[PDB]
C-alpha cells in the first residue's frame, strides 16, 4: 500500500480536446456534488467549444468558462457549491482535477489541472478527479503554449467535446 494511496474512483469522462484525448477518473463518493455538476455540464454540451483560458507554467492549466473571458461559468445548482475536501485526496502530484473558485463554497463551472503539486491548496480546492496515467501527456500538452503577461494563452486549447463514459449517478 503505498503512501499517499487514494480512494478508489467511480465515473468516467472523456475530454476531447485540441491537446488529445484526457480521460478523467471521477471521485463521486469523496466529492458528490463536484461530480454530479461535472457530469450533468458535460452532457448538456456546456463543456463543449470552450478554452482553456490560464496557464501558470508548472502549476495549472484552467478552463471550463463557457465565455473563455476566466471570470464566466455557472455551476448546475442556480447558485456556487459548496467544498468538498478529503484528507486522501491531496495536491500531492501532477495529473488531478480540481474546482477553481474565487473563495470558500464557490464552485461554478471552471476547474482546472495541476501541472505539478499545489500543497497549498490542500483544503481549498475540490480535488473531484484524476487523469488517467495514459493520458497525463495531452493534459500536460494543454500548457505547452506560448502566454501573455495575464496568463493567457495566445492560442488557447479547446474542449472539442466531453462525453460521460461511466456515470455513477444512474
Not at 488529445?20 to 457530469?39: H, Y
Not at 494543454?142 to 444512474?170: A, G, W
Request: glycine share 10%.
Amino acid at each position: 500500500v503505498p503512501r499517499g494511496s487514494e480512494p478508489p474512483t467511480n465515473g468516467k469522462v472523456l475530454l476531447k480536446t485540441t491537446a488529445g484525448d484526457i480521460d478523467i477518473e471521477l471521485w463521486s463518493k469523496e466529492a458528490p456534488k463536484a461530480c454530479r455538476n461535472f457530469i450533468q455540464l458535460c452532457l448538456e454540451a456546456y463543456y463543449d467549444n470552450t478554452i482553456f483560458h490560464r496557464v501558470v507554467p508548472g502549476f495549472i492549466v484552467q478552463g471550463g468558462d463557457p465565455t473563455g473571458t476566466g471570470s464566466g461559468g455557472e455551476s448546475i445548482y442556480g447558485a456556487p457549491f459548496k467544498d468538498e475536501f478529503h484528507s486522501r485526496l491531496r495536491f500531492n502530484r501532477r495529473g488531478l482535477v480540481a474546482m477553481a473558485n474565487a473563495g470558500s463554497h464557490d464552485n461554478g463551472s471552471q476547474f482546472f489541472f495541476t501541472l505539478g503539486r499545489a500543497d497549498e491548496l490542500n483544503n481549498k480546492h475540490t480535488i473531484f478527479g484524476k487523469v488517467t496515467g495514459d493520458t497525463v501527456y495531452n493534459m500536460l500538452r494543454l500548457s505547452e503554449v506560448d502566454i501573455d503577461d495575464d496568463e493567457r494563452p495566445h492560442n488557447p486549447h479547446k474542449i472539442k467535446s466531453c462525453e460521460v463514459l461511466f456515470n455513477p449517478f444512474d
